[PDB]
Each structure stands twice: as structure tokens, then as C-alpha cells.
Amino acid sequence: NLRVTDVTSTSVTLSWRYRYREVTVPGDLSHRYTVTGLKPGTEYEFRVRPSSVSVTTGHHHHHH
Amino acid sequence: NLRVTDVTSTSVTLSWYPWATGYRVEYREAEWKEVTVPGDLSHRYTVTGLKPGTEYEFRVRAVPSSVSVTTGH
Amino acid sequence: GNLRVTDVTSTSVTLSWRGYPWATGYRVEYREAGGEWKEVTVPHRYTVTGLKPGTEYEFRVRAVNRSVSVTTGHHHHH
Amino acid sequence: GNLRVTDVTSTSVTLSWRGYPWATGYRVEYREAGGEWKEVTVPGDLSHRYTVTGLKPGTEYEFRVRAVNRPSSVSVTTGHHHHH
Ligand SMILES: [Zn+2]
Ligand SMILES: [Zn+2]
Ligand SMILES: [Zn+2]
Numbered sequence: 001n002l003r004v005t006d007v008t009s010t011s012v013t014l015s016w017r018y019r020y021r022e023v024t025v026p027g028d029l030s031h032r033y034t035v036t037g038l039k040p041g042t043e044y045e046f047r048v049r050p051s052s053v054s055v056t057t058g059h060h061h062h063h064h
Numbered sequence: 065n066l067r068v069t070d071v072t073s074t075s076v077t078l079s080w081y082p083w084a085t086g087y088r089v090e091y092r093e094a095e096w097k098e099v100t101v102p103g104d105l106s107h108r109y110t111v112t113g114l115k116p117g118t119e120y121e122f123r124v125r126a127v128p129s130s131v132s133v134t135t136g137h
Numbered sequence: 138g139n140l141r142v143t144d145v146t147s148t149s150v151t152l153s154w155r156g157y158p159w160a161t162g163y164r165v166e167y168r169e170a171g172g173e174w175k176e177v178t179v180p181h182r183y184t185v186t187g188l189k190p191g192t193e194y195e196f197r198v199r200a201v202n203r204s205v206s207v208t209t210g211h212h213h214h215h
Numbered sequence: 216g217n218l219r220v221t222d223v224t225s226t227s228v229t230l231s232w233r234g235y236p237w238a239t240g241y242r243v244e245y246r247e248a249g250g251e252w253k254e255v256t257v258p259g260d261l262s263h264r265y266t267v268t269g270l271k272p273g274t275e276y277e278f279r280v281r282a283v284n285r286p287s288s289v290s291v292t293t294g295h296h297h298h299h
Contacts, residue, residue, distance in 0.1 A: 029155040031153075041134070058133065105263070206296055
């Protein structure tokens, strides 16, 4: 299925059993890749090639 | 003067006193808990064991001003 | 080769290996340069922790039921 | 003024220091065993901490940090092999 490991304020990582909504990894054995530099606190949809995962990042940081 | 270094689904990293032996970080959900990190050089601490998608409040005092963090969902 | 070392620390190393067809999981075997093999079974990436800094280690991953050398970091004074 | 190595990788080193108060900032100096000194300035004093990247795997490095103005010294060797 789909697996997400590291959800930060800035990133989310995905792992599939290679090419998000509020890139291309040409393998060869790269089962995973990590998106970088996105907006904290946002809902998302991720799909890899069915099937999709929904993600929310986390506000806030530095500082308040 | 407190900074939130990293926010994860289950953890938070914090960075931030005169004649301080150690520091006590207190945190609560939206249940107060407190863990003290001894050492003046202990200027950072990572709080683990947090629930994903939950709002936390963090404050550190030497042994104002606090910060709020929401974990991933 | 087919097995690569992504990150190396004084006390840990992370490894990634190509998937095998029709396999329920993998057994990673590692040893010191003495040395006696130790294996950890993970049902395709894993980080082996609890290692001694500044020493040469050997790692291999095996399909079940049927490679790479790593040196950790060294530093003074701390 | 102790100087601490929090994390060491094949290509990077993490350092933390006491840092005398109040420093306008910090300068990190490093050199390989045979190589030349290189200097990086960190505007303090928020950060008693810094991560040095871009190092060669399996290399001897020497580090010392000075408050600015204008110390504590540490020696580091990184790990090998990676690749493959
Ligand atoms: Zn939702
Ligand atoms: Zn040496
Ligand atoms: Zn070697």
C-alpha cells in the first residue's frame, strides 16, 4: 500500500511498494523519496505511480 | 525567548539563564507534564511521545514566553 | 553494488538494499573486524544502532530463507 | 567553555559550544590533517551550535571555536565506506 514516515512542518516522506496537491525519481531501487520545503499547517493529497494519502503539516514554529 | 527547531508527528525540538543548573520544560495538550533537562549547555531538548495531530503548549523555565505546536496528521 | 550505505554515524549506520521477489522480509547480518557475526531480522531499509565509534564493521543482508564495509566516526575530546 | 560534537556523518559534523556571553558571534575554524585552515562565522549568540557540511568521508579534521570579539579544540574523523 502507501506509507508515510517523516511528517515535519517543512516535509513529508513517502514509500511505495518514479514520479502532490494542497517530481521524478528514476529508480532504480529508490523505494522512497522525500518532498522538501512545503507550507506548514496545510492539508494535502499524495499519490504515487491509485492510491492516495492525505496529509496535514504542523503549525507553528519559531516562534510565538 | 524560545524557538521551535523541528516539528514532527510525534516529537518537537526546542531551543532557548543566569546561574541555571538545568532547565525544566513543561508541556500540555489542548494535562501538564514536566521534564527537566539539567546542564547549562543543555540548551536544546526534543519532546517525544506526542500524539499526531494534537495541539501542545510548551514552556521552559530555569531551575514565559511559551509557544504552541500542532503535530502532524 | 546491490547494497548501499546511505548515512554513517559514530554509533549507527543506515542501509538500503534492492527488493527480492516473493520475500516476506530480510535478515541483516553484521560483525566487527574480530569478529563474530550478529544478525537483526526486519520484515527495504534499516538503521543498525548500538555500534562502537571509530571501528570497522561488516554488513550483509540476506533473503529469507535464501557485502559492505563501514567505519564509524572518531573524535577527541568529547 | 566545553566544545561538544553532537553528530558526525560521512560528510558533516555537528558542534556545540558554551559560548562566552555576550559574543557578537562565533567563528568556526577547521582544517584537515594535511589541509588548510578554513573559517566560517556564525552570528551569535542564539546558537551555541553549528553543523559543518561538505566534508570528505574518512577524513581527519581539526576544529576550534572562538567567540567574536576576534579556546576549545576538537579532533574528528568521519566514516567510510558509503556508496555501494
Ligand atoms: Zn483532514
Ligand atoms: Zn586520531
Ligand atoms: Zn577502508
